[PDB]
């Protein structure tokens, strides 16, 4: 069987990707942006 990850040879260790997938935090100041937008029509 072959190694699922990692490994390497005479040229060194095999490069590997770090799976980043952080969505984290939905802040559940556009107030002025909103009023400003509507205060012209």
């Amino acid at each position: 069987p072959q190694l699922n990850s990692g490994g390497g040879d005479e040229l060194g260790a095999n490069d590997e990707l770090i799976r980043f997938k952080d969505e984290g935090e939905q802040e559940e100041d556009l107030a002025d942006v909103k009023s400003s937008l509507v205060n012209e029509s």
Binding site: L3, G8, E10, G12, E16, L17, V38, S41
Partner: protein, 522 residues
């Protein structure tokens, strides 16, 4: 205050009993000119805060306003009615009234209007609802607001775009289905365009938040990359706004593992190397992470990072990072990538030593380091060992006995009838591979054999995993050129497995096996 309270109380009664019920009837008129004129009056009334309650507390009125807006063919009428609903959307009561009156589907329909005044009233009102009305998000999605919103990203008013993008962020967060709809509507390209087009910070910020949410989606991620997302987000890494810089970094990191084939990454890479020296821990952490993924199997990126002094920058990051593994793991993985398979790989292997990084690097193999960092560090040491100049210093830092310890423990833990996200089989291959390279040196060979490793290395020849068989045969190949070692290997009964390995499809395994066999016979 008593005067206004009395006057308002009286006016509220006159409105709730005469004005409102009358205007509701007129809004329902067959004559469109009457409806239009009535819509104006209702709008004028909505401008006065004290008059709003009379308007919102009448379901018949609200429903007539919504129905009129959604069905009218008069621009001015659509404007007045949308403006009215906006005026009623500042508090819980009004929002609930608009919601129960079926205002959401009507407000969404208005997003298809070519008139700015209508669009502006529509998006800000939907935003208020999205922020405070429970059930608003699902209604907007069901009404197809996502598609309409994405289509509006080609508009030019930056304030309008800021609100529109924020609605997308609110609707998309933690909702995989909403992200796919956005993707299907061409959201990625439209969002990336904004990032490389406008300078309005609030818009870049809200837009970067939508991209972050979409960056964890396996479908949106490659779409963002292909749209030039990486280069675009990189444009703002030095912007005065910290919230923007950090959102761009988090997004870049999420996307990084799917951007290893992108061109035009010079500027981005150069900026990330600089950020490695930031006092901000979250910035250094993201810079290290993104660089690790970008240098992965891309010689061009490796070359550029080295050319901008990435080796020195990464060693410095590791030196001041101490036990923070969030920083050291990616930084070490980056150094690992940079020390192999490229024109400047050899130069990078020496540079780590020349920048006083060997001691701290070997130190990371020891507690309290966790398996992810150890695995990465073993990989880096393995590459550093390719450089003859690193043979002695690595031994002097105690790398050999620590690698042997990790190997023994990892191997014994594989005995049976994932640890901290790492398979012990990976550590066995890694440590043995590192030892195989370090064994090219004669003094190291003595140290290695003195730790009574031969019995283990021979045992490894029986491993099902051929990658492990390869490194075991290889280290034995190096050690075997020593008489006592060759005889010890023979005594361990290595002749049988090695003979079997001679047939291995793996040329490396076969060659090493034969080498060891020849050494023993001699």
């Amino acid at each position: 205050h008593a005067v206004v309270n009395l006057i308002n109380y009286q006016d509220d009664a006159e409105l709730a009993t005469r004005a409102i019920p009358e205007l509701t009837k007129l809004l329902n008129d067959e004559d469109q000119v009457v409806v239009n004129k009535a819509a104006v009056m209702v709008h004028q009334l909505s401008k006065k805060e004290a008059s709003r309650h009379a308007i919102m507390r009448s379901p018949q009125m609200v429903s007539a306003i919504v129905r009129t807006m959604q069905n009218t063919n008069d621009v001015e009428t659509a404007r007045c009615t949308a403006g009215t609903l906006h005026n009623l959307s500042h508090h819980r009561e009004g929002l609930l009234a608009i919601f129960k009156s079926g205002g959401i589907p009507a407000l969404v329909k208005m997003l298809g209007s070519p008139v700015d005044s209508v669009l502006f009233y529509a998006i800000t009102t939907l935003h208020n609802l999205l922020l405070h009305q429970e059930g608003a998000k699902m209604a907007v999605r069901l009404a197809g607001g996502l598609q309409k919103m994405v289509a509006l990203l080609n508009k030019t008013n930056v304030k309008f775009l800021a609100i529109t993008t924020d609605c997308l962020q609110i609707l998309a967060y933690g909702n995989q289905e909403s992200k796919l709809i956005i993707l299907a509507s061409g959201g990625p390209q439209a969002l990336v365009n904004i990032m490389r087009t406008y300078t309005y910070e609030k818009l870049l910020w809200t837009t970067s938040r939508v991209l972050k949410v979409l960056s964890v989606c396996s479908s949106n991620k490659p779409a963002i990359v292909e749209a030039g997302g990486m280069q675009a987000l990189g444009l703002h890494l030095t912007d005065p706004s910290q919230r923007l810089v950090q959102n761009c970094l988090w997004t870049l990191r999420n996307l990084s593992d799917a951007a290893t084939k992108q061109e035009g990454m010079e500027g981005l890479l150069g900026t990330l190397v600089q950020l490695l020296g930031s006092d901000d821990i979250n910035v250094v952490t993201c810079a290290a992470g993104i660089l690790s993924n970008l240098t992965c199997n891309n010689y061009k990126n490796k070359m550029m990072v080295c050319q901008v002094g990435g080796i020195e920058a990464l060693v410095r990051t590791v030196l001041r990072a101490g036990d923070r593994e969030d920083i050291t793991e990616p930084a070490i993985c980056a150094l690992r990538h940079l020390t192999s398979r490229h024109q400047e790989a050899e130069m990078a292997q020496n540079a780590v030593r020349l920048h006083y990084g060997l001691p701290v690097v070997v130190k990371l193999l020891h507690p309290p380091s966790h398996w992810p960092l150890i695995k990465a560090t073993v990989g880096l040491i393995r590459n550093l060992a390719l450089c003859p100049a690193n043979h002695a210093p690595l031994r002097e830092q105690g790398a050999i006995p620590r690698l042997v310890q990790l190997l023994v423990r990892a191997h014994q833990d594989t005995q049976r009838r994932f640890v901290e996200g790492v398979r012990m089989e990976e550590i066995v291959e890694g440590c043995t591979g590192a030892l195989h390279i370090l064994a090219r040196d004669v003094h190291n060979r003595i140290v290695i054999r003195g730790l009574n490793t031969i019995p283990l290395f021979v045992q490894l020849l029986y491993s099902p995993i051929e990658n492990i068989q390869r490194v075991a045969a290889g280290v034995l190949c190096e050690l075997a050129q020593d008489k006592e070692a060759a005889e010890a290997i023979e005594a361990e009964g290595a002749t049988a497995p090695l003979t079997e390995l001679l047939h291995s499809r793996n040329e490396g395994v076969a060659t090493y096996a034969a080498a060891v066999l020849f050494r023993m016979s001699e």
